[PDB]
Design a protein around this ligand. Structure first.
Ligand SMILES: Cc1cc2nc3c(=O)[nH]c(=O)nc-3n(C[C@H](O)[C@H](O)[C@H](O)COP(=O)(O)OP(=O)(O)OC[C@H]3O[C@@H](n4cnc5c(N)ncnc54)[C@H](O)[C@@H]3O)c2cc1C
Ligand SMILES: Cc1cc2nc3c(=O)[nH]c(=O)nc-3n(C[C@H](O)[C@H](O)[C@H](O)COP(=O)(O)OP(=O)(O)OC[C@H]3O[C@@H](n4cnc5c(N)ncnc54)[C@H](O)[C@@H]3O)c2cc1C
Ligand code: SF4
Ligand code: SF4
Ligand code: SF4
Ligand code: SF4
Ligand code: SF4
Ligand code: SF4
Ligand code: SF4
Ligand code: SF4
Ligand code: SF4
Ligand code: SF4
Ligand code: SF4
Ligand code: SF4
Ligand SMILES: O=S(=O)(O)CCS
Ligand code: FES
Ligand SMILES: [Fe+3]
Lengths: 291, 149, 184, 138, 653, 187, 187
């Protein structure tokens, strides 16, 4: 398996530890990860989909062309990029006037999208193509902790195009994190939004923190030692949001937050140092003690 | 055309009577036995495959035989001699495109015993030369008598 | 009170036309299938802590109340897609709200922080560009000191500015090219 | 200056009713096609398709009931087997497979019939005229 | 004889004339060979238009008529009778459709629409020249009817036919007639018991002198056509000689095994030796082998000696002239709507389960209880439109009865327990027939039932208490409600019955988009099908209540009695026949016909195909498949279709 | 005599209304109001059409689809709110309809060029004469009384006298036809 | 003997169970009282006249006559107005198919006028009904059109010479008709 590795923005430029975690974990499961040289913002659907839909799709198609000229499919570790690139690929697959509109724009930069790129989420790639048994085979250090799994919204939905099964009661991320030896705990309103998407974190911050605080509370009451996500936007909201929540509302939880690449990293015997856990706004060390 | 048929046509015109050709398709004259339950074709065979049974209709055995879409008159020597009819006498008076009708018949009865489940792409994929199978002697008189280039 | 003169009979058709061909005529015209059941509002997490009622946004559009475009409420949708999943009338609510935001944005109703995010992508190719903490961190972690991203590739950054100008996106956010800053 | 000439064969029960439904619903589509009524799609055979191309057809459309919904139980299954052979026969003759289009359209599916006519028109318009009629006329 | 054709272009007011230049089409039609008279008129189907055609037929000695107007699916019978009145054979008339297929879909392309109409007229004339005069085939009608399904609808059809004096067979799949009405406690809007109205009908049907009831039986084969159906009924084995059976029920007491009772929707549990419900007709018991253990225990307590394990299913063969399909419906399975938690939460139930709970003769003795606590719920929520008006489950239709039965069972719960609070979550209240709106006013004013306008988004179970919380917006307040309930009832909608696919395959009838059976015309033939001699009655034709199902049963008996009373009908002659002088018996056609019409025969020493005219429905598949052209379908000959294709491009000259 | 560009439909006029003595539902007005709204749109796409309703009752086969079609395909508007009054502008002849948009909690006052009252069904003028001649009863809705709504939906308690159609109660064409045939069987 | 303790007791005294029970006892005793003096009576067999009467020539009455006629029963169809067709003849289209209303109904109107077993009395009214089931004796007043059905064309060249304008009831009074008239063209 050879996949063009779309990086996005937050993971490469802020939470680089997730990138390090991903590069080794997926090499270890046996995926060659190619670089998309010159790939930009996907672009973030919340702001760019909200300002101009044509600009979102045109800039998204441009990143797809990078992979199509490479003769390779994209995999991403972020729901944000996954949603943006997947939905762009599908609409360009399905709507031929939208495809015409985009290539007349990309024609001015010597590009043309032809419909060959498939976009894959790394969690879904692991489940459907690699197998959850292959993660258990490589667990060097079992992680015997209770995990509050946060699927994020743009992973499973819209189900009518994602075709990743149920969005109401999914099992895909729970079985993945349970292959590391951890226990995914049920909690109230498990599938609810973290609050950050759709530009809401930037424009209505306290609204976003209200939803994040609800999620954290339900995880803690179900005995979660940390939360795990499949999106740097979720990561930032759970991690940085706890600082903001504390400064604005006055609650402190010090609830550790991990991206799935980091959690898999720990299972496969990676050095916490190369996971860049120190850059987390909330200390992971209470978690490191239990594992 | 067989020699007697040439004789009947000409002598009729010498006498002043109109000549009239035979009108049925070939299975009439052919001595091979059919199924009274009707023609059903499970697979399609090229004429070199297997061992054709001397008495059973070749079309029911799976060989593209043009007797069904070909006018009688010759005596059916090819099926009598162990090979399918190639259709050289041409269609009956009620068929214009001999190859089109043979294709219609062949497709209708292919997998007819399993009508709703037989894959409709088995038959085109098993025939590598279609124009040559169905238009040997009549292509210039077919509705499409050329290949466009 | 609400009179005819305060209503815009064609608002729904604007939203539809703004959504053609992206994300699609059939996608956004699903707005006209809504029968005001309120399943979306019951599913909305933003509605559980604000005055935001998803169903009312759809309603105000169908009736022609332009103040939707000026409202703060359309911007409280997180695009979780839950209403989309459950709507019994196949209303593509999440795409309808984003299209409405386009018309809101071209009317000047864009948050400053959102304009910034758009400026960073136009200038550096990325909503979150790399700083020098990014370099020193990526060093210690074992990664390429600079990510292989458009930010460090003038050709790809040329391509985006070319495309951006063609789309009029720079004029939408009011970005000035030589001053290299946004106009308020 | 040039408009596609399209010929249609629609079953009386489902597809002909779908074309009526589009007319009742004022569902506009290009005026290239002319529809010939038959009781069943099983009435359609290769010779009818080939005859239309001979006459000058740039595209040929056939519409019948959904598979299983045939008013005569299984007429469409015979037609489906014939049309798959006809697709590849048309290629051996240098006629683009895309010039032939068969669809399953029920009487209620006026909208589907409308877009089928639109998609087929654009496909045939982009292919240009079929050059068979002008080769035989040399 | 040389064709003499009259061509008539219709304006249809401006429906055609507004887009198609009819005078120009008319002028063009006179350029085609054999067109003797051509004219445009504003309403051709109007009496002045028909009188114009018939009068030209005589004055101009026409042998063909072309009418370019609307669809033959509307006026083909109209114009066929018009020409027949003038002495012209009805099959020398050809319909060109220039409205539905031209003027109405090309309104913005008038020039091209006019040119299209011209080609559609020429294609019509082209086939018209080669049409032949045909004669309708008369057939006898067997004086007997068959009803499939013994609910209210089918029972009503059998009693009406039987009362008219026609022998009638009534086939019931389950051991008892009665259908889903038998499962209901009361019925809106009178609030009678279902037994009040149904049970006397069940009694009358069982002892009617002209009705043979085959309970625990199913139709397994139907062949033939109107007036001449040969049907095979598999009368399943009960393993109890019914003639000797008393129905006392002593045997059920001794049975040592338990079985999920389907009549109670999986709530109540029965024995393998059982009778569906205490008022079942026939009042006979049945042994289900799927669980029978054969210890003889049942036979020991039975006086008559009716029990008998050696029983084998018997196949009955019967001639009938007409068939009425009345196989009812099933409740929607709301498991797929995951947000509501049916099949997951104990205290989420369907409405049809509630009927079995609230019914006096029910497994709970008429007591509404929580299936987790066993306690009586003091707060109840009704959720409307479950499985209806919902594109996510592929059911975009209204199930018609769920608004009324929810208010009905709310009244009944309030009567048994006035302290109960009942909330109905709805989108529209559809109380649309006589007394319904008043029933709706009464539910709120008199019984204090509460109505929330808001389709719930999800049901949240309290795992600890089994209580349920219903999240929904009060749309009439603009606020989100999260009320707690001891029991949630899902007003599931109607869907076709499981065996509908089997019945459809046997009778050869169509279905509407909602998957119910398709009537011949949505306005003027609500109980006819497009298959002659086959009719519909009840909920299998579409979601409807009892009064509508009963009226349809009586309507289907009137329609199905017309062929029986006439004793003869006519079948269309658009049929296939063999030209013996062209057929050399290739055998291609035989297997193509799903009715077995073409047959290989031996006349004059040779083998030749032969079509049994009575078995041909006129599909035209096997003429299209005949490689010799001996096989042709009248009115759709290959040569006729060939001319029609040429007419698109040139006059057939 | 000009063509009206803005048209308002008012539902439940003379039905579901205790003030006029008609507490029943007339059964067809929801569907015929959407119907003629479609037929007006077809003859004039730019016509604005609002339907002021309380419940949309599209209850039979194809009716709910017809209701969805009216809104999605024909762009017909639905206001949930029974109008309180109509006010004519004596200058122009136009009409203002006043109603609460109950799904917003705000009072609407939109202007229209033509207002259509979706009037309900009442017994026919001669129903009194016929009733005395046949000797049959009437239900609370003033239509003729069947023997029993479910046991005998087209019989009367007068032996040998039967009912069919809207004289027995408000209903559409397929319902009247079915009763026509039902009454033929019973008679 | 029948005692009514439901409609007359249990359903109207739900809040007074003790008195409803006492009342039911009295109603049983009043029934038993009459029961003691009831006498064996013989049902009276009467022949049934092999003919039907349908009052009203709309889609519902037309359907009943055609069904009865097609069964082989003589049937009389009495229509009060000049023409059959009912309100369906006034509709433009019919939901949910939007079929032309008159265009689908007119073949039924044609069929009923031509039917061998149906006698159509248009512009007529039933003025008296006597007898019982199977033995009705009815009077039909064929009202005078003052035009000879046999000697009149139906062309309508006498309206122009009429000074009286009358509310055209077929058009609900929106257009005026002459004293001499035909209701609608497809009549
Ligand atoms: C919860 C609920 C409450 C309701 N309440 C009311 C109410 O209060 N009032 C009211 O008027 N209506 C009510 N209805 C609607 C009512 O149930 C239907 O109108 C009525 O049952 C329809 O009768 P039917 O004979 O057409 O179909 P069914 O009642 O379903 O009867 C069909 C019969 O056909 C038989 N059958 C099925 N398949 C076959 C086969 N293959 N071969 C032979 N026989 C077969 C079945 O055994 C069954 O006996 C309610 C429906 C539901 C779900
Ligand atoms: C505005 C409107 C729109 C509608 N649209 C639709 C629609 O789109 N689709 C649909 O299905 N339904 C529709 N309906 C309902 C439809 O009109 C009725 O269902 C239908 O007319 C019922 O036919 P009927 O024969 O029962 O009654 P009618 O149509 O009224 O016919 C009764 C007949 O009896 C005659 N008559 C009356 N009194 C006497 C007497 N004393 N003696 C002799 N004859 C008499 C009358 O002249 C009339 O000819 C609509 C109704 C209205 C008001
Ligand atoms: S062999 Fe060729 S010819 Fe002889 S029968 Fe079988 S088919 Fe007809
Ligand atoms: S081939 Fe020519 S000859 Fe040999 S059989 Fe077929 S036809 Fe008679
Ligand atoms: S759900 Fe679909 S329909 Fe019910 S409201 Fe929200 S949108 Fe309009
Ligand atoms: S999507 Fe935007 S709207 Fe639909 S629910 Fe989630 S938030 Fe409320
Ligand atoms: S004929 Fe068909 S079209 Fe010509 S008028 Fe009567 S209906 Fe309108
Ligand atoms: S016992 Fe023998 S008889 Fe008494 S019931 Fe059970 S079966 Fe019928
Ligand atoms: S035998 Fe079969 S049935 Fe008779 S009892 Fe033992 S089990 Fe119940
Ligand atoms: S009936 Fe009342 S409930 Fe059953 S569907 Fe139509 S509306 Fe929803
Ligand atoms: S197919 Fe044409 S030819 Fe062969 S038998 Fe049946 S009919 Fe005679
Ligand atoms: S036509 Fe359709 S039906 Fe009549 S015979 Fe040939 S096949 Fe059997
Ligand atoms: S139908 Fe629609 S309108 Fe006519 S009454 Fe019942 S509700 Fe009011
Ligand atoms: S005038 Fe009136 S009456 Fe004298 S004829 Fe012409 S129509 Fe018949
Ligand atoms: O929707 S956004 O693109 O703003 C981030 C959600 S992952
Ligand atoms: S009748 Fe339509 S496909 Fe057979
Ligand atoms: Fe007509």
């Amino acid at each position: 398996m050879k996949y063009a590795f779309f990086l996005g923005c937050i993971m490469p430029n802020r939470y680089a530890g997730v990138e390090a975690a991903t590069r080794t974990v997926m090499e270890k499961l046996g995926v060659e990860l190619v670089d998309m040289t010159g790939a930009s913002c996907c672009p973030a659907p919340g702001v760019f989909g909200s300002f101009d839909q044509k600009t979102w799709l045109t800039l998204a198609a441009r990143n797809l062309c990078i992979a199509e000229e490479m003769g390779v499919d994209i995999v991403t570790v972020c729901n944000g990029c996954y949603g943006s690139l997947f939905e762009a690929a599908h609409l360009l697959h399905d709507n031929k006037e939208a495809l015409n509109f985009v290539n007349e724009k990309l024609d001015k930069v010597g590009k043309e999208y032809k419909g060959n790129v498939k976009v894959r989420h790394f969690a879904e790639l692991i489940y459907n193509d690699i197998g959850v048994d292959k993660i258990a085979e490589k667990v060097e250090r079992p992680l015997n902790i209770n995990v509050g799994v946060h699927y994020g919204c743009h992973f499973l939905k819209p189900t009518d195009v994602k075709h990743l099964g149920s969005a109401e009661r999914p099992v895909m991320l729970d079985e993945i994190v349970e292959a590391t030896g951890a226990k995914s705990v049920p909690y109230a309103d498990k599938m609810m939004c973290c609050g950050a998407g759709g530009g809401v974190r930037a424009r209505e911050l306290e609204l976003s923190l209200d939803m994040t605080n609800e999620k954290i509370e339900n995880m803690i009451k179900a005995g979660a030692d940390c939360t795990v996500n499949v999106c740097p936007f979720c990561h930032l909201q759970f991690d940085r949001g706890q600082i903001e929540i504390k400064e604005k509302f006055g609650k402190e939880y010090n609830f550790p937050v991990l991206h799935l690449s980091q959690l898999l990293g720990l299972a496969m015997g990676m050095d916490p140092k190369d996971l860049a856990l120190s850059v987390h706004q909330i200390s992971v060390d209470p978690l490191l003690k239990k594992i | 055309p067989n020699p007697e048929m040439i004789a009947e046509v000409v002598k009729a015109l010498l006498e002043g009577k109109e000549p009239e050709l035979p009108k049925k398709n070939l299975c009439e004259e052919c001595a091979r036995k059919k199924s009274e339950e009707g023609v059903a074709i499970e697979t399609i065979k090229r004429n070199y495959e297997g061992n054709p049974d001397p008495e059973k209709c070749l079309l029911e055995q799976g060989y593209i035989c043009l007797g069904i879409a070909t006018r009688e008159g010759c005596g059916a020597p090819c099926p009598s001699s162990g090979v399918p009819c190639s259709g050289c006498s041409g269609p009956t008076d009620a068929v214009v495109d001999q190859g089109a009708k043979m294709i219609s018949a062949l497709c209708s009865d292919f997998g007819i015993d399993n009508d709703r489940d037989v894959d409709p792409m088995i038959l085109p994929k098993s025939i590598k030369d279609k124009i040559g199978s169905f238009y040997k002697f009549t292509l210039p008189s077919a509705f499409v008598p050329i290949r466009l280039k | 009170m609400i009179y005819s003169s305060d209503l815009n009979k064609n608002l729904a058709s604007q939203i539809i036309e703004a959504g053609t061909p992206i994300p699609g005529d059939d996608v956004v015209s699903s707005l006209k299938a809504c029968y005001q059941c309120g399943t979306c509002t019951g599913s909305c997490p933003s509605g559980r802590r604000t005055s935001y009622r998803t169903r009312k946004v759809i309603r105000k559009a169908l009736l022609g109340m332009d103040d939707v475009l000026d409202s703060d409420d359309i911007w409280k949708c997180t695009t979780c897609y839950t209403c989309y999943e459950r709507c019994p009338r196949d209303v593509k609510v999440t795409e309808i709200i984003k299209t409405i935001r386009n018309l809101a944005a071209q009317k000047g109703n864009m948050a400053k922080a959102h304009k910034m995010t758009a400026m960073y992508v136009l200038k550096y190719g990325h909503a979150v560009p790399a700083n020098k903490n990014t370099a020193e961190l990526r060093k210690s972690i074992g990664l390429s000191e600079k990510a292989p991203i458009a930010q460090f590739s003038e050709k790809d950054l040329n391509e985006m500015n070319t495309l951006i100008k063609e789309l009029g996106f720079d004029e939408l956010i009011g970005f000035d090219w030589e001053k290299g800053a946004l106009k308020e | 200056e040039w408009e596609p000439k399209i010929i249609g064969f629609c079953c009386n029960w489902c597809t002909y009713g779908g074309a009526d439904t589009a007319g009742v619903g004022r569902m506009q589509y290009p005026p290239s096609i002319r529809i010939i009524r038959v009781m069943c799609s099983g009435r359609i055979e290769p010779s009818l398709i080939l005859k239309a191309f001979k006459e000058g057809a740039d595209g040929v459309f056939v519409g019948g009931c959904h598979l299983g919904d045939c008013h005569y139980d299984s007429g469409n299954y015979k037609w489906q087997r014939r049309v798959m052979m006809l697709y590849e026969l048309l290629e051996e003759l240098g006629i683009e497979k895309e010039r032939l289009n068969h669809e399953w359209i029920s009487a209620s599916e006026g909208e589907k019939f409308q877009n089928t006519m639109k998609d087929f028109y654009n496909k045939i318009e982009a292919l240009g005229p079929c050059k068979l009629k002008e080769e035989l006329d040399k | 004889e040389e064709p003499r054709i009259g061509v008539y272009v219709c304006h249809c007011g401006v429906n055609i004339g507004g887009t198609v230049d009819c005078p120009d089409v008319t002028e063009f039609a006179k350029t085609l060979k054999n067109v003797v008279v051509a004219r445009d008129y504003k309403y051709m189907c109007a009496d002045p238009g028909q009188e114009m055609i018939k009068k030209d037929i005589k004055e101009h000695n026409l042998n063909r008529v072309v009418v370019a107007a609307c669809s033959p699916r509307l006026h083909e019978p109209t114009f066929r009778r018009c020409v027949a009145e003038a002495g012209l054979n009805p099959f020398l008339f050809e319909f060109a459709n220039i409205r539905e297929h031209c003027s109405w879909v090309h309104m913005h392309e008038k020039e091209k629409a006019t040119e299209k109409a011209k080609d559609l007229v020429r294609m019509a004339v082209a086939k018209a020249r080669l049409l032949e005069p045909l004669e309708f085939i008369k057939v006898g009608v067997t004086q007997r009817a068959l009803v499939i399904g013994g609910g209210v609808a089918g029972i009503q059809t059998a009693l009406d036919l039987g009362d008219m004096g026609f022998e009638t067979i009534l086939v019931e799949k389950t051991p008892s007639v009665g259908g889903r009405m038998a499962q209901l406690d009361k019925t809106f809007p009178t609030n009678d018991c279902s037994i009040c109205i149904l049970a006397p009908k069940m009694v009358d049907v069982a002892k009617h002198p002209n009705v043979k009831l085959y309970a625990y039986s199913e139709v397994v084969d139907v062949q033939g056509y109107v007036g001449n159906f040969k049907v095979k009924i598999m009368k399943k084995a009960r393993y109890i000689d019914e003639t000797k059976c008393t129905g006392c029920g002593q045997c059920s007491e001794v049975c040592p095994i338990d079985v999920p009772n389907e009549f109670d929707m999986g709530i109540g549990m029965r024995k393998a030796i059982y009778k569906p419900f205490p008022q079942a007709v026939p009042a006979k018991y049945t042994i289900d082998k799927e669980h029978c253990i054969e210890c003889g225990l049942c036979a020991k307590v039975c006086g008559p000696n009716a029990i008998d394990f050696d029983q084998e299913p018997e196949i009955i063969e019967a001639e009938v002239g007409t068939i009425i399909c009345a196989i009812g419906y099933d409740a929607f399975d709301p498991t797929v709507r995951e947000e509501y938690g049916y099949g997951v939460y104990d205290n989420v139930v369907t409405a049809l389960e509630l009927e079995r709970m609230i019914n006096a003769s029910g497994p709970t003795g008429g007591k509404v209880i929580r299936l987790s606590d066993g306690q009586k719920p003091k707060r109840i929520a009704f959720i409307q439109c479950v499985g209806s008006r919902d594109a996510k489950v592929g059911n975009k239709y209204c199930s018609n009865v769920c608004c009324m039965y929810a208010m009905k069972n709310s009244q009944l719960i309030k009567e048994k327990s006035p302290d109960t609070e009942i909330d109905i979550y709805y989108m529209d209240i559809r109380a649309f027939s006589k007394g319904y709106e008043e029933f709706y006013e009464r539910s709120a004013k008199q019984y204090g039932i509460k109505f929330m306008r808001g389709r719930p988004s999800q049901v949240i179970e309290d795992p600890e208490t089994g209580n349920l919380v219903v999240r929904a917006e009060d749309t009439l307040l603009g606020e989100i409600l999260e009320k707690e309930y001891d029991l949630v009832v899902l007003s599931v909608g109607m869907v076709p019955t499981k065996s509908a696919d089997e019945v459809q395959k046997i009778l050869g009838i169509s279905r509407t988009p909602d998957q119910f059976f398709m009537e011949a015309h949505p306005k003027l033939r609500p109980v006819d099908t497009a298959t002659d001699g086959v009719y519909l009655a009840g909920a299998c034709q579409g979601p409807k209540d009892i009064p509508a199902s009963v009226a349809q049963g009586s309507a289907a008996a009137s329609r199905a009695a017309i062929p029986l009373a006439k004793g003869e009908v006519e079948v269309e002659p658009i049929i296939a026949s063999v030209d013996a002088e062209i057929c050399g018996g290739c055998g291609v056609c035989v297997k193509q016909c799903p009715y077995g019409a073409p047959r290989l025969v031996e006349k004059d020493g040779k083998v030749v195909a032969e079509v049994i005219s009575a078995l041909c429905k006129g599909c035209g598949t096997c003429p299209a498949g005949c490689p010799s052209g001996a096989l042709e379908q009248d009115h759709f000959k290959t040569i006729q279709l060939f001319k029609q294709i040429e007419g698109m491009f040139r006059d057939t000259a």
